[PDB]
Amino acid sequence: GPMDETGKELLLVLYDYQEKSPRELTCKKGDILTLLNSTNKDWWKVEWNDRQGFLPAAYLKKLD
Known part of the structure; x- marks a missing residue:
């Protein structure tokens, strides 16, 4: 709902990543x-x- 989404900048994971x-x-x-x-x-x-936690930026796409 809106409380979960408010202020939230979403990202798509482009490639699998193993910690x-x-x-x-x-x-x-x-x-x-x-x-x-x-x-x-x-x-x-x-x-x-x-x-x-952290992921490499190359693995991520901004959605907002």
Whole structure:
């Protein structure tokens, strides 16, 4: 609903990614994430349901 979506900048995962550290997410192509921080050009902090962590920016497409 709207409370879940409000303020949220969404991302599409373009390629599967397997975490390589405890602060990284594992995701699949097609997953929809929320952007938390894009200040690092190589690594973006993201949110997926109850998880917050990093994925490489090359694996992500901004939707907003």
